[PDB]
Assembly symmetry: C3
Homo-oligomer: 72 residues x 3
């Protein structure tokens, strides 16, 4: 079952990165609301796109797990 175990471990790793990304995104939003500006908006958008990027990777891993389970 190592194929599945490895996939779930990679999922765990990606979710940890996703959480860190989300934390930074939320911090940026709080600062943006306090002191808004074009620069702060661009910064926040950057971090939002980065969060979406990791979400896409997490979804890829989940799809892989589902395919492993299906051939099983």
């Amino acid at each position: 079952k190592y194929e599945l175990r490895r996939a779930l471990e990679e999922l765990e790793k990606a979710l940890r990165e996703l959480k860190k990304s989300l934390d930074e995104l939320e911090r940026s939003l709080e600062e943006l609301e306090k002191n808004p500006s074009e620069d702060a908006l661009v910064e926040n958008n950057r971090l939002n796109v980065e969060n979406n990027k990791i979400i896409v990777e997490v979804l890829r891993i989940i799809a892989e797990v589902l395919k492993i389970n299906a051939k099983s």
Copy 2:
């Protein structure tokens, strides 16, 4: 199988919240495009971050379901 049932029910609940969040996000975007401004942009970013926040929660639940299925 209650562990799995409960997880899938929680998934359903989170997805409903996610849909409401997305609806509000889309409404905000439409208003932003009609009448853009720094304030409207900050508001839209707020709702986008909130949507990402719920997505992360949904992904957590999915990971839990996959772990339940794996020990099964």
Copy 3:
């Protein structure tokens, strides 16, 4: 097992759309950082919301797969 196969095929299709959306989102971000403005920010937000929209659809499909596996 066609129910599951069809769901996984639909998942694959949605993930391909998600990747294209993400690529366009990243391109927009790069241009935004190079030449920022209110218009560019609105454009980037539009593409970010669109990416979230597809993510929600992908999560729906994943939930369906998990429900198929559960009744199985």
